[PDB]
Amino acid sequence: PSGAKLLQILNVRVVGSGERVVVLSHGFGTDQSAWSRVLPYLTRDHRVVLYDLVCAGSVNPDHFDFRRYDNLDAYVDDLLAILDALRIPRCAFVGHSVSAMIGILASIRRPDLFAKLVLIGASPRFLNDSDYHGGFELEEIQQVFDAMGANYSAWATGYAPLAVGADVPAAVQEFSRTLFNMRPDISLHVCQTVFKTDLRGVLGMVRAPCVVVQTTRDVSVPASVAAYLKAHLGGRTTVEFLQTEGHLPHLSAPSLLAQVLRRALARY
Numbered sequence: 445p446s447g448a449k450l451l452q453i454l455n456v457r458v459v460g461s462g463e464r465v466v467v468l469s470h471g472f473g474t475d476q477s478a479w480s481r482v483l484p485y486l487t488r489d490h491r492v493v494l495y496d497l498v499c500a501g502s503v504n505p506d507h508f509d510f511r512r513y514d515n516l517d518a519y520v521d522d523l524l525a526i527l528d529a530l531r532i533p534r535c536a537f538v539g540h541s542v543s544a545m546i547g548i549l550a551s552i553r554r555p556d557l558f559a560k561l562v563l564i565g566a567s568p569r570f571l572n573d574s575d576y577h578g579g580f581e582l583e584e585i586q587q588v589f590d591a592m593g594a595n596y597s598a599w600a601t602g603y604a605p606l607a608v609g610a611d612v613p614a615a616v617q618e619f620s621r622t623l624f625n626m627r628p629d630i631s632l633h634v635c636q637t638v639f640k641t642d643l644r645g646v647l648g649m650v651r652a653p654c655v656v657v658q659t660t661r662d663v664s665v666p667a668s669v670a671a672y673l674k675a676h677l678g679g680r681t682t683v684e685f686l687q688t689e690g691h692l693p694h695l696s697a698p699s700l701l702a703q704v705l706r707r708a709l710a711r712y
C-alpha cells in the first residue's frame with residue numbers, strides 16, 4: 445500500500461553509506477535487531493537497508509492480514525515496495541531462513557534489482573519428498589503446529605535452544621526474546637506458510653550470483669540441502685562453510701559470519 449507508510453510500518457532503516465547497497469532481511473522468530481552484531485562490519489563500506497517482516501513482533505500485529513500473507517509472494521511484494529520507495533535500482537540481498545526464500549522469489553520477479561544473494565539457513569523445501577530430503581515429515585510438523593497452538597510459550601522455550609544449536613546462552617535469550625514477542629497465531633501462520641512452500645522448480649530462474657552459507661549443523665536444514673541449492677540455483681553459486689553450528693549464526697557467531705559477508709559483498 446505504500447512508500448512512506450510502508451517504510452514506517454515495517455520499521456525501515458537505512459544506515460552506513462556506499463555505492464554498494466545491501467539489504468538485510470531477517471528470519472522467523474527475530475526482527476532486524478538480529479543483525480545488530482554483524483552490522484558494524486558492513487556500515488563503513490555499504491549502505492545497509494534493514495526492515496522488519498510483517499510477522500515480526502516489533503511490527504504492530506494488526507497489520508498482519510492473514511489472507512494476504514498466506515503465501516510468500518505477499519512478503520516479496522513488501523520487499524519490492526520498500527526498495528522502490530527508497531529508489532534503489534540495484535542491491536545485494538542477505539536473507540535468513542524464510543527471507544532466503546523471499547530473496548530467491550524477489551530475484552526472479554526483478555532480476556534487474558538483485559545483483560547478488562547471500563542465503564543463510566536456506567532451504568527450498570522443508571518437507572521430504574520421493575527423492576528429496578528436506579528434513580521433515582508431515583506428521584512431525586503436524587505435532588509442532590499443535591504444540592504452537594496448545595502452549596506457545598512452552599513450545600518457544602523448547603525451540604529457542606534447538607534453533608541456536610550451539611550452547612550460547614546469550615543467543616538463546618535473544619532469540620527467545622523475539623520469539624516470545626511474536627503473536628502466537630501469526631507465528632503459527634508463518635510456519636504453516638513456510639512448510640507449504642516449494643521453491644525447487646523455480647531455482648533455475650534465479651540469475652543473480654548466490655552465496656549459500658552453511659553451518660556445520662542446522663536443525664532445519666540438512667547438509668544435503670546446501671549442495672542441492674548449489675546444483676539447482678541458476679546463477680553462479682558457491683557454498684561457504686562456517687566453522688560452527690546453528691540456524692542463527694548472526695546471533696551465535698556474528699564475527700565469523702561477518703567474515704563471510706564482507707567477502708561475499710566485496711564485488712557485485
Ligand SMILES: *C(O)(O)[C@H](C)[C@@H](O)C=O
Pocket residue numbers: 471472540541542543634635638664
Ligand atoms: C526460518 O526460520 O524462517 C525458516 C523458514 C524455518 O526456520 C522455519 O520457518
